[PDB]
């Protein structure tokens, strides 16, 4: 306060995030004719989506004749019926349209005989509503798809007058009487504080992998947008559902794509057995992520360990053609060699299931509007939007389908732009904000910048990370989760006993990583408590105490003879977590999933069924 300068910016719409989700929303808004400002802590290229290897799904019918409705069914079946079907309808239908848009933007997709966008088999996708065998609808830029996607989206975004606040750490949402006015942000370059206000705000900050000790995600995946929503009192959703990607280098935790499993790659144990045929008969080693990795983490605890210390497993490309590896998957060919020293042609890659995708995030409409939970119902938060991994329309549900997140990025980023475009026009008066607004956000900065503590940021981060890694792991019991819940609660009280060192204005990476720690902890609290509260096994979240999938009905037998279980007695519902900032208490509620589609006659609702690929 008064030691800091304030610079109030005025815009039509603010987009916080420069990933695929953020960029598509940003330039799409500018294309609609809005004065759009994009606020991003990293340079747009550096954003994670660049690390995306697998591909982007669209029923284009380039390999075999395909219907987008088949893609709808495969997403909702994969979501363990926690997926809201109104959003899945919208995503799977726009899927072909959105991809063809990118190829037209200039995204260098791989090609085939016909000259169409090359698709290939991926994790858990089928034809004819789960009956027609293997589906090939994963459009890819040969193992570097997210890289090309981010680069072309960014490339094309220079065609419009989008104001890019590059290297700006957004701190908190500008809020007044429920209504969102934009963001208050610290400028990493000079230490200044900026109040960017708008009629609408898009939140596309991506996931929060860095809550755990081991992940595939970037160092900058710190669930910042989640925390900005958290501190506003607005609910988060399904934060206990965390995807464990089955294949990632045992060492630093880098990713080996699921495209390896779609091109003909097999997973081999300590005896050399094709062990995924022992669990899944129909899909085998190309089954859903929630089951494959949970079969792998089972093998580690068995004693059938496949390594120098019997702690990891293998992904084998020994019997794959060397001619195909050079063309289809060259990005893993380098990163397997660099991080392990593995010839992908002769040797198998040492893999270990670790944190990959955050299913939950910020509750949102199929249109993309952030929702608060009032009176056991829903309410659209005015001028607040969220898209990507940051959000939770729960188009992924309990378990995200392979190569859907990059689709989720484009589609719902685009959707956020359309919702703003239709609800109001550019040049509509920007709602003015109080002179003393976001004042505590600045004070959160100032108190943390001059922090005379006893436990430095780095030490506290590790205390959070390894706790989550052993408590909120692949399998989780009540006893372990209970210890974890008060173990994570412990470290929240430590968030003042923290000692900072760097006390400058220009590029205080020491300060931003601490702000990231506050956001990571706020993510962690809601993640662990939701898991301990949920007393069932659903998708990625699997309780050893309650390995039963608890629905409104026992869907194993016919529907007729049963009566519906009361909403507050079953577990097929969205976890709505809140947390008080001062006490660090996680109080949570629930709201129903959406079953109705956007059109029943065009796309039928898929009722809950047995879960096994």
């Amino acid at each position: 306060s008064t030691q800091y300068p304030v610079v109030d910016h005025e815009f039509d719409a603010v987009v916080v995030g420069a990933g695929g989700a953020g960029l598509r929303a940003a330039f799409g808004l500018s294309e609609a004719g809005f004065n759009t400002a994009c606020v991003t802590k990293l340079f747009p290229t550096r954003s994670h989506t660049v690390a995306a290897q697998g591909g982007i799904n669209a029923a284009l019918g380039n390999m075999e004749e395909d219907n987008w409705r088949w893609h709808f069914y495969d997403t909702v079946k994969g979501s363990d019926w926690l997926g809201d079907q109104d959003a899945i309808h919208y995503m799977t239908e726009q899927a072909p349209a959105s991809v063809v848009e990118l190829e037209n933007y200039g995204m260098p997709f791989s090609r085939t005989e016909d000259g169409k966008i090359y698709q290939r088999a991926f994790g858990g996708q089928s034809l004819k509503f789960g009956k027609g065998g293997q589906a090939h609808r994963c459009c890819c830029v040969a193992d570097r798809t997210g890289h090309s996607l981010l680069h072309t989206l960014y490339g094309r975004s220079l065609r419009y007058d989008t104001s890019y606040f590059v290297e700006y750490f957004a701190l908190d949402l500008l809020m007044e009487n429920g209504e969102c006015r934009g963001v208050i942000a610290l400028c990493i370059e000079d230490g200044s504080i900026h109040r960017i206000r708008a009629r609408n705000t898009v939140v596309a900050t991506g996931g929060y992998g860095r809550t755990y000790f081991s992940c595939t995600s970037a160092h900058t995946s710190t669930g910042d947008g989640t925390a900005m929503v958290t501190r506003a009192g607005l609910p988060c959703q399904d934060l206990e559902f965390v995807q464990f990607h089955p294949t990632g280098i045992y060492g630093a935790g880098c990713l080996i794509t699921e495209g390896c499993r779609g091109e003909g790659g097999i997973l081999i144990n300590s005896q050399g057995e094709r062990f995924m045929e022992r669990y899944a008969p129909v899909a085998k080693d190309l089954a859903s992520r929630d089951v494959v990795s949970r079969s792998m983490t089972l093998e580690i605890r068995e004693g059938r360990g496949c390594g120098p210390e019997k702690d990891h497993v293998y992904l084998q490309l020994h019997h794959l053609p060397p001619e195909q590896l050079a063309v289809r998957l060259p990005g893993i060919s380098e990163t397997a060699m660099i991080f392990a020293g593995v010839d992908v042609t002769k040797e198998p890659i040492p893999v270990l299931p670790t944190v990959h995708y955050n299913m939950g995030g910020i509750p949102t409409n199929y249109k993309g509007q952030v929702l608060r939970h009032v009176n056991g119902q829903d309410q659209v938060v005015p001028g607040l939007y969220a898209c990507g991994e940051a959000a939770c329309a729960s188009v992924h549900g309990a378990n995200r389908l392979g190569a859907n997140s990059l689709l989720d990025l484009v589609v719902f980023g685009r959707a956020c732009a359309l919702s703003i475009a239709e609800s109001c026009r550019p040049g509509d008066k920007v709602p003015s904000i109080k002179p003393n607004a976001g004042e505590e956000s600045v004070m959160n900065l100032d108190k943390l910048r001059f922090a005379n503590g006893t436990i430095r940021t780095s030490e506290l981060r590790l205390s959070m990370q390894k706790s989550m890694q052993s408590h909120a792991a692949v399998f989780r019991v009540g006893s372990v989760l209970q210890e974890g819940c008060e173990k994570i609660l412990r470290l929240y009280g430590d968030l003042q006993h923290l000692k900072t060192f760097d006390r400058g204005m220009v590029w205080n990476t020491d300060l931003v990583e601490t702000l990231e720690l506050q956001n990571l902890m706020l993510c962690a609290l809601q993640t662990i408590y939701g898991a301990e509260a949920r007393k069932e096994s659903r998708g990625a979240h699997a309780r050893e105490d309650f390995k039963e999938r608890v629905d409104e009905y026992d869907y194993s037998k016919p529907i007729q003879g049963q009566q519906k279980k009361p909403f507050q007695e079953h577990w097929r519902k969205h976890t709505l977590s809140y947390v008080d900032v001062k006490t660090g208490k996680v109080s949570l509620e629930y709201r129903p999933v959406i079953d109705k589609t956007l059109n029943e006659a065009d796309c039928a609702t898929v009722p809950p069924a047995i879960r096994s690929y």
Binding site: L158, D161, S163, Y164
Partner: protein, 138 residues
């Protein structure tokens, strides 16, 4: 903000700031291709200077060339010393002649991989010593 405006505001920001330019020649690792490009520039400058000194003496200095050579014989220097004078003429000439072809090969879009620069680079370097010792023996 435009492309041209971004650069225009980049320079104002830095040239009026107490920011230091990072070290470059002080630190960057010397390589054959980089060092061999330096010599090509050097030999070019060295050669053209000689040619200019030759022209700007035909118009300026008195006498004829035969008179000038008779003045060189006046010092009646050692055959080895006159060979050293002769070698130091052809050496910068030949290097530039050989590496000049290597540049012209590159201009065709050929031989531009990293191993090829050390291969042909040595082949230029070796051709130099041979064609310089060869010509000075005439």
């Amino acid at each position: 903000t435009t492309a041209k405006e971004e650069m225009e505001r980049f320079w104002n920001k830095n040239l009026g700031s107490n920011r230091p330019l990072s070290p470059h020649i002080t630190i960057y690792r010397w390589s054959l291709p980089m060092a061999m490009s330096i010599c090509h520039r050097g030999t070019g400058i060295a050669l053209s200077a000689g040619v200019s000194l030759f022209g700007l003496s035909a118009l300026l200095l008195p006498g004829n060339f035969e008179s000038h050579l008779e003045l060189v014989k006046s010092l009646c220097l050692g055959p080895t010393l006159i060979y050293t004078a002769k070698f130091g003429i052809v050496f910068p000439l030949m290097y530039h002649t050989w590496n000049g072809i290597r540049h012209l090969i590159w201009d065709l879009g050929k031989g531009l991989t990293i191993p090829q620069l050390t291969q042909s680079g040595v082949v230029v370097l070796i051709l130099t010593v041979l064609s310089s010792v060869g010509l000075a023996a005439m």
